[PDB]
Amino acid sequence: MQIEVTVRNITPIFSAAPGSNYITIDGTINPPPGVSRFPLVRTRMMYVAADVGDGVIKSVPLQIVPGNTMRSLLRRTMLKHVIEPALVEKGNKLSIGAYATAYSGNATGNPDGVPSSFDEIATMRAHPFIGLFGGGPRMLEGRLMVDSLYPIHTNAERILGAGYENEMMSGPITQVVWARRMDPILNLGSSEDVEVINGGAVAANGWIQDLLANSKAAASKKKNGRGLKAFNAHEVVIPGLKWVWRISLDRPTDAQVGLVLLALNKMTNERIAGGHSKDYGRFVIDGVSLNGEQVWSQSGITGGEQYFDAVAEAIDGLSSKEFEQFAQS
């Protein structure tokens, strides 16, 4: 069961990467020390072996979203769009470990190895949601596999080996977006602007003299309480790029494919890689190929009616007691 979801990011992609990355005022990344350098968290990047330009493969950068983020996004879109409304209508509520297994898949329900009987293992893998994301204390195998969101790029051209040379990106993929927080007690200035302050004028001026003393202390330190002014950078993937998304279900039930398809239907109101305030990760689904045949329409998934019927009977049959038996015992 292979699903290939090709999406187009309406807004940029910023999947934050570890490391204290450094950048000059220009675009030079991680400069040698002794120059004025700025903090920077880039997007997630990996070295991929691409057969570009010649017969040999080389380690080229390829900035994507990790598959863990994507599996979580799929899990949460099912939860909020399908599990929340169907479960809420019935009236069922979830415990500590039931919610931890449904939403995090973590073993905090009981943090010891649960011995799971085979009948329980078969019916919870035959259960749609617990089949897709097994885990937690019962340590269950997930039927659902999420590949990471690969952009249609020269660097990913061998990952997308056949059928993706058209509409395929080349050259640079990322761009540094700069963000400055500044002090808004620097941005005041009328008497009408200051009457809303507890203490008013004197309180604002005390903030001013505190900032002055902090600036003199920092200047004498160079030759720990910081202020509000903060100028920083973050490298983001450019918007409009087509990303691929491989969703492989290892011998699924029909309700499982229906659940993934309903998630792909209702996924348009949810976002990728965080960056919520900047509203990064906004996207639109261009296509969905179910085992290679295109099934995505502008208004959802047209076709796969057996998947929709199976998941409809399943979500009519959805109950929190299955979540609790997956959690506690």
Binding site: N166, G287, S297, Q298, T302, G303
Partner: protein
């Protein structure tokens, strides 16, 4: 087929889901963009969709070309739902013949059957006329094709019914009486151009309902062109100049039109040498002539010329000069390149609509170009997934052989392309159509292939229409020799090259064995609205429309399932070069193999 739509049992099984989706989104009020191949039986679907909309109580309008109309009324003749709600056909004036003028011509040219037909009411004689008269329950007298069946060489446009014809003649009486046909039936068939005349007739303030509850448009890709034809008013100078002889200011108007290879294209008022005083003088000298003593067919010429002059008077329309194919006669045109108000007024009067054609989507289901052709509201637009069956490409034979010279209207290309065309004609075991883009390319090919191919060559030019060479091509395939056709214009889009002498057996269909594309059809549309759209979007519109014309030229090969050994050739050297802008013409090319 449980919970069936009416007439879906005669619908092919491949398009059954497209019917369900089109009916669902049309009943929801959206304007459906539906794309389906030529041989998939789209007429049955229009029949099913109009029937299922008709039993809801909806006033349903089906807009289609007049050749498609007979098939469409035949697909919706015998299903019981539209038998209950009724089906009627709406026609304008150029669907009727003038009885007295054609009488005078039949006496003059000694045509006994035409004269015996008009003496006695002009009763319907062709089979299509009588069965459509039975379906409408109006006797379709005085129609053109009954006149043309008795005399094919009649000067139509001289005998075409005009608005100036007297009220006592039976043809204008029949047309005015049948103008109320939409009252007495639930489904009304009409042309694209009748619907566009309705839309302008609603913009000005009968022919069709003021609100169409469900509108299905067959052959959708022409509908926009229909609006571009009804909002364009043309002044023809030579017929007027001959009519007044039977003013000097219009002679000065022609002399001033001389001074302004692009001659006043897409320019509303930026050039006024003496155009507006000559236009006002033309208006006053043409409108003040005495109507008493003016001939009943001459006042029509005066009125169409004054309507063109008053359309150029407003300054809200563009201007463009053109010449005739016959000679360098002066043509003045006031067309419009922005059709948003008219098409928006059309889609306001439509509750739900179905976008139907073989050619609607650029890539995949992308109908944003065609939504931007007919100004469909995006809140109401819906671009349904197309059908493209395997059997449209399975009998197709793709050859790697081509002409290495690119077509730049050079002699060297024409000799090399003529050599490749001679090779195709030698390996042909049936009819061959090569499709050139330009008249110059066709003339060059003709001079290189006429003596080489003898009688087999057919050329289409200024003096040879596409329909004449159609009947010629069918005549040569009837005679057993293998014709070659140097076709362009309408030979690209809208020609049925399937044998109707072989209805039940498509396996032996051999009218078109070889289709050859000599050049990628770039720049083949130069209408005002499309030139404006090119100016907005850039080369994306041109490459998009070139891909559309390329797929319409490639649609001539397969018209029904069951055919075999169909040869496709492309000889443009940009197909086999590494250039990026010709990349869309790869992927349609990628749907064939070997």
């Amino acid at each position: 087929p449980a919970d069936a739509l009416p007439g879906e049992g005669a619908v092919r099984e491949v398009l059954r889901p497209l019917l369900k989706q089109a009916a669902e989104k049309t009943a929801a009020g959206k304007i459906v963009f539906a794309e389906a191949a030529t041989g998939t039986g789209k007429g049955r679907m229009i029949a099913s969709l109009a029937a299922a909309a008709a039993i809801k109580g909806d006033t349903v309008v089906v807009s289609a070309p007049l050749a498609v109309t007979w098939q469409l009324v035949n697909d919706m003749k015998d299903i019981p739902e539209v038998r209950r709600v009724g089906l009627t056909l709406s026609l304008g004036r150029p669907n009727f013949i003038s009885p007295q003028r054609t009488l005078e011509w039949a006496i003059d040219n000694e045509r006994a059957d035409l004269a015996a037909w008009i003496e006695g009411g002009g009763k319907p004689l062709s089979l299509r006329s009588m069965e459509t008269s039975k379906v409408i329950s109006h006797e379709l007298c005085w129609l053109l094709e009954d006149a043309l069946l008795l005399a094919e060489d009649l000067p139509a446009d001289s005998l075409l019914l005009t608005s100036e014809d007297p009220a006592d003649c039976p043809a204008q009486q029949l047309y005015v009486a049948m103008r109320s046909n939409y009252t007495e039936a639930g489904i009304i068939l009409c042309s694209h151009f009748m619907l566009a005349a309705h839309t302008r007739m609603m913009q000005m303030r009968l022919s069709l309902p003021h609100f169409i509850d469900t509108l299905i448009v067959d052959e959708a890709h022409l509908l926009e062109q229909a609006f571009a034809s009804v909002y364009t008013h043309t002044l023809r100078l030579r017929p007027l100049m001959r009519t007044i002889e039977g003013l000097d200011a219009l002679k000065e108007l022609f002399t001033q039109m001389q001074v302004a290879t692009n001659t006043s294209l897409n320019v509303p008022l930026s050039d006024v040498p003496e155009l507006i005083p000559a236009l006002k003088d033309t208006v006053k000298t043409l409108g003040a002539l005495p109507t008493k003593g003016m001939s009943r067919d001459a006042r029509s010429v005066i009125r169409i010329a004054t309507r063109a002059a008053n359309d150029a008077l407003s300054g809200h329309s563009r201007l463009r000069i053109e010449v005739t194919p016959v000679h360098s006669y002066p043509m003045l045109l006031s067309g419009r390149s922005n059709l948003q108000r008219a098409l928006l007024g059309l889609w306001n009067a439509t509750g739900g609509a179905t976008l139907v054609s073989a050619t609607l989507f650029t890539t995949g289901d992308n109908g944003s170009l065609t939504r931007w052709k007919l100004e469909v509201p995006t809140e109401r637009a819906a671009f349904l997934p197309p059908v493209h069956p395997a059997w449209t490409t399975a009998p197709v034979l793709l050859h790697k052989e081509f002409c290495a010279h690119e077509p730049d209207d050079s002699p060297e290309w024409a000799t090399e392309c003529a050599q490749t065309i001679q090779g195709v004609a030698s390996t042909a075991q049936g009819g061959t159509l090569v499709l050139c883009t330009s008249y110059q390319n066709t003339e060059l090919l003709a001079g290189r292939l006429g003596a080489a191919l003898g009688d087999r060559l057919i050329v289409q030019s200024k003096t040879s229409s596409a329909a004449t060479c159609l009947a010629q091509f069918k005549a040569k395939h009837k005679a057993g020799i293998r014709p070659v056709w140097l076709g362009l214009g309408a030979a690209w889009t809208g020609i049925d090259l399937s044998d109707h002498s072989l209805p039940d057996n498509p396996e032996l269909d051999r009218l078109l064995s070889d289709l050859v594309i000599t050049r990628i059809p770039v720049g083949q549309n130069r209408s005002l609205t499309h030139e404006r759209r090119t100016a907005i979007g850039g080369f994306r519109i041109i490459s998009q429309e070139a891909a559309w014309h390329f797929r319409q030229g490639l649609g001539r090969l397969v018209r029904r399932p069951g055919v075999t050994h169909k040869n496709l050739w492309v000889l443009d050297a940009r197909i086999y070069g590494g250039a990026a802008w010709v990349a869309p013409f790869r992927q349609i090319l990628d749907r064939y193999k070997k």
